[PDB]
């Protein structure tokens, strides 16, 4: 599951250029547009009836900031993702009742958003490193389910 030192440097380098609040809203929004059954967790967020209604939804945007904020913090602990996300794992299981498959879907959407934003800079090896990361984060968030 682990990245080479070259990959860790690649992840950190690209992430330094990422507006986490913005990419967070974009990623969560695209999750809800591309896989609309994931809207099941966000009835309280209001209008989710169109792609624009989802992407521009202020509550979707706000939650995206929160989610990718936690994701961002975890990038400082690539050697201990399970420990890092243990309490969020427990919370998403016990309180939020979120199927961990959703973490995998979000990871893939985030990779697409990074590709969209960075273009050719999101090279195949940079993608490979980020695939290791999102798989690791999704597995870590899944780890304390019971």
């Amino acid at each position: 599951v682990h990245l080479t030192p070259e990959e860790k440097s690649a992840v950190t380098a690209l992430w330094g250029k990422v507006n986490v609040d913005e990419v967070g809203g974009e990623a969560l929004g695209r999750l809800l547009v591309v896989y609309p059954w994931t809207q099941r967790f966000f009835e309280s967020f209001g209008d989710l009836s169109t792609p624009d209604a989802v992407m521009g939804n202020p509550k979707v945007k706000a939650h995206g900031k929160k989610v990718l904020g936690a994701f961002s913090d975890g990038l400082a602990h690539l050697d201990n993702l399970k420990g890092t996300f243990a309490t969020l794992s427990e919370l998403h299981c016990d309180k939020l009742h979120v199927d961990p498959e959703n973490f995998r879907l979000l990871g893939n959407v985030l990779v697409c958003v990074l590709a969209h934003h960075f273009g050719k800079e999101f090279t195949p090896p940079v993608q490979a490193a980020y695939q290791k990361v999102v798989a690791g984060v999704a597995n870590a968030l899944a780890h304390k389910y019971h």
Partner: protein, 141 residues
């Protein structure tokens, strides 16, 4: 695609199941909750205690839907239309979980059909459950 041979295998196997269907549905759910605990995230509103009457009730609903699917194996998309609507627009269970329940139904049938669970019937049952799952997720997006 369910072959003519698949359909005969399914009808015969589920025919043997008979009035045990509801029971086997509940058993499959229990096996699923224990073997694949993430599937419990869809039932936080349920009583999941041992022998839960609510789980047993749900097992009967799942089984009755399957019994109807078997009876209309030539036209399952139409027979399961209302249920497919509910799954797509309300329940919204992630598609990966249908494979988990299908597996647990297969294990349940195997444990209760020592004679009928031949390799060929096993294959046909798996195709059938996959086909039902496909119909139930067909309107998701």
């Amino acid at each position: 695609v369910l072959s003519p041979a698949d359909k005969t295998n399914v009808k015969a196997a589920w025919g043997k199941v008979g009035a045990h269907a509801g029971e086997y549905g509940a058993e499959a759910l229990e096996r699923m909750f224990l073997s694949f605990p993430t599937t419990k995230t869809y039932f936080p509103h349920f009583d999941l205690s041992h022998g839960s009457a609510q789980v047993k009730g749900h097992g009967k609903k799942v089984a009755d839907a399957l019994t109807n699917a078997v009876a209309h194996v030539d036209d399952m998309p139409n027979a399961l239309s209302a249920l497919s609507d509910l799954h797509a627009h309300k329940l919204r269970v992630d598609p990966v979980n249908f494979k988990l329940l299908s597996h647990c139904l297969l294990v349940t049938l195997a444990a209760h059909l020592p004679a009928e669970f031949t390799p060929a019937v096993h294959a046909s049952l798996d195709k059938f459950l996959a086909s039902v799952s496909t119909v139930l997720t067909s309107k998701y997006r």
